[PDB]
Amino acid sequence: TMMLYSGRSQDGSHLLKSGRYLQQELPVRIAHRIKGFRSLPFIIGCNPTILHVHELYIRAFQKLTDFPPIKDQADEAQYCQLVRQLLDDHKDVVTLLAEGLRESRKHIEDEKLVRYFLDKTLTSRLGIRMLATHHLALHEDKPDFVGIICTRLSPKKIIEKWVDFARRLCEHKYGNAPRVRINGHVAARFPFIPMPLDYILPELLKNAMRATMESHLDTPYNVPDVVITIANNDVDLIIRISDRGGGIAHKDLDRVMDYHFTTAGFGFGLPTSRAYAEYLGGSLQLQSLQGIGTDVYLRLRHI
Amino acid sequence: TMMLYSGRSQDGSHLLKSGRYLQQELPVRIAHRIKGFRSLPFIIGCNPTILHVHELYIRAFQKLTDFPPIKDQADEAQYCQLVRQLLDDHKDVVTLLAEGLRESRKHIEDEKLVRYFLDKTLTSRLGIRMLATHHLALHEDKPDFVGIICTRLSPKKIIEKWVDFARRLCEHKYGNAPRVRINGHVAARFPFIPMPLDYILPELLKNAMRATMESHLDTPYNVPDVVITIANNDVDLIIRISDRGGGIAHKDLDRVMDYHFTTAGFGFGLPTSRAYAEYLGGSLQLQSLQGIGTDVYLRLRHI
Numbered sequence: 001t002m003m004l005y006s007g008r009s010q011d012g013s014h015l016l017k018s019g020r021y022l023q024q025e026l027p028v029r030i031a032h033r034i035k036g037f038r039s040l041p042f043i044i045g046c047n048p049t050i051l052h053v054h055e056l057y058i059r060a061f062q063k064l065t066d067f068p069p070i071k072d073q074a075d076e077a078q079y080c081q082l083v084r085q086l087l088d089d090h091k092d093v094v095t096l097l098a099e100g101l102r103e104s105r106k107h108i109e110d111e112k113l114v115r116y117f118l119d120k121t122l123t124s125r126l127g128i129r130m131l132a133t134h135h136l137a138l139h140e141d142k143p144d145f146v147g148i149i150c151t152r153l154s155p156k157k158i159i160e161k162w163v164d165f166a167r168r169l170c171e172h173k174y175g176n177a178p179r180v181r182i183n184g185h186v187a188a189r190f191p192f193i194p195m196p197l198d199y200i201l202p203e204l205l206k207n208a209m210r211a212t213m214e215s216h217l218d219t220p221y222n223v224p225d226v227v228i229t230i231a232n233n234d235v236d237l238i239i240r241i242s243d244r245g246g247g248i249a250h251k252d253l254d255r256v257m258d259y260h261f262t263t264a265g266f267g268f269g270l271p272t273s274r275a276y277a278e279y280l281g282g283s284l285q286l287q288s289l290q291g292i293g294t295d296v297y298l299r300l301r302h303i
Numbered sequence: 304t305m306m307l308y309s310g311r312s313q314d315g316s317h318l319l320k321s322g323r324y325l326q327q328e329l330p331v332r333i334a335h336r337i338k339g340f341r342s343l344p345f346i347i348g349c350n351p352t353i354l355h356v357h358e359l360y361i362r363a364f365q366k367l368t369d370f371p372p373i374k375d376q377a378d379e380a381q382y383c384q385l386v387r388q389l390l391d392d393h394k395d396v397v398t399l400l401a402e403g404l405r406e407s408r409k410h411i412e413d414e415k416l417v418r419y420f421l422d423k424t425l426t427s428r429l430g431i432r433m434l435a436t437h438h439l440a441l442h443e444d445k446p447d448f449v450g451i452i453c454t455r456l457s458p459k460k461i462i463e464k465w466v467d468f469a470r471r472l473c474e475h476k477y478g479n480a481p482r483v484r485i486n487g488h489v490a491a492r493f494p495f496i497p498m499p500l501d502y503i504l505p506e507l508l509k510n511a512m513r514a515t516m517e518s519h520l521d522t523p524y525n526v527p528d529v530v531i532t533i534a535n536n537d538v539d540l541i542i543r544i545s546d547r548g549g550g551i552a553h554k555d556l557d558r559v560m561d562y563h564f565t566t567a568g569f570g571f572g573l574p575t576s577r578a579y580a581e582y583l584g585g586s587l588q589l590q591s592l593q594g595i596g597t598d599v600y601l602r603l604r605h606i
């Protein structure tokens with residue numbers, strides 16, 4: 001449904017076609033988000049933070065539609081400025097929704113409703129930001145990238161990037177962090193879009209590390225490694241993240257995938273990651289060994 | 304629904320109550336199996352091997368109902384002889400059903416039907432044999448057993464028993480076998496009924512070993528270990544069997560749980576194991592890392 005244009009061209013004609021495609025596509029997608037807010041239960045839609053986000057989307061739609069049809073490179077250039085502005089203006093939207101919904105959702109009893117709204121809203125948003133960021137990136141001169149598409153992504157490398165990140169957060173909080181071993185198809189390289197991994201990987205790694213530290217309070221200086229296995233085949237990329245952090249309790253298991261649920265970010269890591277994975281044609285599955293640890297399986301389809 | 308009597312008594316009164324319970328229970332359960340055969344699609348029910356099994360059940364029902372009410376230890380003793388006879392007469396039933404159904408099932412188009420019949424038939428049969436074997440075992444003087452209930456089963460020990468068994472089959476066929484490492488709650492001991500593990504474990508181990516050998520045809524002398532993790536908590540026992548045997552292909556994944564499906568026993572290992580696990584209140588789940596290996600998770604509820 002959403003096209004990431006991979007074409008390049010000397011005169012910069014492909015930038016024009018891309019820009020014109022965005023211009024047709026973005027207002028429509030934003031209008032769908034606005035309809036989602038309009039259909040929220042009244043009591044939730046009246047929450048001042050939800051109203052703020054609703055108004056941001058209306059404002060986005062207005063600016064996008066106010067922008068004249070792109071006729072030349074000069075126009076396309078100014079359109080990119082608008083798109084950059086909107087991307088920035090909306091950067092905290094996930095956090096505002098989480099906040100606005102936290103209490104308000106407790107009112108209504110159809111708890112399916114908020115899950116559906118958040119799944120639909122956050123995944124459409126991911127898709128919108130991918131499209132827009134892709135267009136902007138077409139102007140960049142990065143080797144191994146066409147827009148936001150890496151032509152030879154290494155799962156091992158991007159995993160290591162987020163491992164370093166998560167380990168530093170963990171070390172800050174607990175004074176130590178599990179080491180991470182990576183095995184399986186460590187030398188794999190293939191065309192792939194980093195952005196979803198950039199959201200999902202740190203969420204899963206933070207979870208695994210927290211769980212490991214909290215279950216080893218007596219030996220923070222000596223905790224079990226987290227073990228990550230990469231499997232690359234013609235159909236999908238599988239990343240298994242296995243910890244010895246004690247598992248997800250039976251009493252918690254049916255709730256960990258709910259937005260807002262946490263035993264402690266703000267309980268969004270798992271449901272958001274799963275929503276993103278499925279949006280892109282993959283999945284996120286959990287296997288809990290209560291008393292031992294948890295295996296988390298991220299699957300993403302190849303391009 | 305099915306009670307395994309754990310009571311013991313000096314005068315041998317508990318043997319009488321147990322026997323009388325069997326006498327009430329067995330004919331009813333067998334009649335249900337007979338109704339299952341009666342409702343099989345005509346073309347399948349007419350298969351001579353299916354008819355043979357159908358007739359065995361009728362004959363079982365006749366003998367059980369022909370047996371007079373148990374009034375004393377002398378009677379109970381003779382009833383045990385009948386039960387032993389029937390257990391033996393029916394020992395090859397799974398194999399006969401597999402054979403009788405193999406071709407005949409291809410006729411009818413509702414493929415849900417055979418799955419349902421086999422799930423229902425095989426699990427009811429497991430339950431019946433557990434009840435009967437339990438009663439017979441009440442006469443035995445084994446330490447750590449009440450009937451077929453082990454009062455302090457070690458998952459590690461019973462796993463090692465079947466590991467040795469599977470490794471010998473594997474070595475016979477391929478000239479070598481993966482080593483198996485066991486980790487997690489290796490010292491766990493708890494009350495538990497071995498019989499279902501005795502069916503399931505060798506099936507899962509044979510699968511893992513076959514997969515490992517067939518994916519390492521160039522280095523049969525040096526193959527990846529199978530790794531088994533035990534997790535014991537207050538709710539269930541989890542046994543994870545992880546291999547590096549290349550995984551279950553995407554094109555096969557939705558078929559491996561079908562009776563008769565095999566890429567090579569006779570394609571019964573997985574569906575039978577899952578049926579047994581669920582019958583007992585647990586589950587059997589597969590995680591395939593195509594190109595790398597497979598994790599199989601057996602969960603069984605504590606007693």
Ligand SMILES: Nc1ncnc2c1ncn2[C@@H]1O[C@H](COP(=O)(O)OP(=O)(O)O)[C@@H](O)[C@H]1O
Pocket residue numbers: 203207208211243245246247248252256261262263264265266267268269270271293294
């Ligand atoms: N690897 C894991 N081991 C144990 N528990 C986990 C793991 N991953 C997630 N959880 C549980 O799931 C809950 C929800 O996780 P998440 O949605 O990422 O939100 P948060 O981390 O903000 O609590 C966590 O609070 C934790 O209880």
Ligand SMILES: Nc1ncnc2c1ncn2[C@@H]1O[C@H](COP(=O)(O)OP(=O)(O)O)[C@@H](O)[C@H]1O
Pocket residue numbers: 506510511514546548549550551555559564565566567568569570571572573574596597
């Ligand atoms: N651990 C495993 N690794 C790879 N493939 C497996 C594994 N376990 C089962 N399979 C696949 O599932 C199929 C069905 O298995 P099963 O029901 O046990 O029957 P059988 O072993 O008789 O073929 C196997 O033929 C094999 O292709």
Ligand SMILES: O=C(O)[C@H](Cl)Cc1ccccc1
Pocket residue numbers: 026030060083086087090091093125128129132
């Ligand atoms: O992040 C958001 O919530 C929106 Cl989709 C940002 C946006 C980007 C491009 C055009 C319009 C809105």
Ligand SMILES: O=C(O)[C@H](Cl)Cc1ccccc1
Pocket residue numbers: 329333363386389390393394396428431432435
């Ligand atoms: O294995 C079988 O198919 C039956 Cl349940 C054997 C049996 C055992 C006890 C009483 C009747 C039948």
Ligand SMILES: [K+]
Pocket residue numbers: 255256257258259260261262267268269270271
């Ligand atoms: K959550």
Ligand SMILES: [K+]
Pocket residue numbers: 558559560561562563564565570571572573574
């Ligand atoms: K099968």
Ligand SMILES: [Mg+2]
Pocket residue numbers: 203206207265267268269270
């Ligand atoms: Mg989290």
Ligand SMILES: [Mg+2]
Pocket residue numbers: 506509510568570571572573
């Ligand atoms: Mg098998």
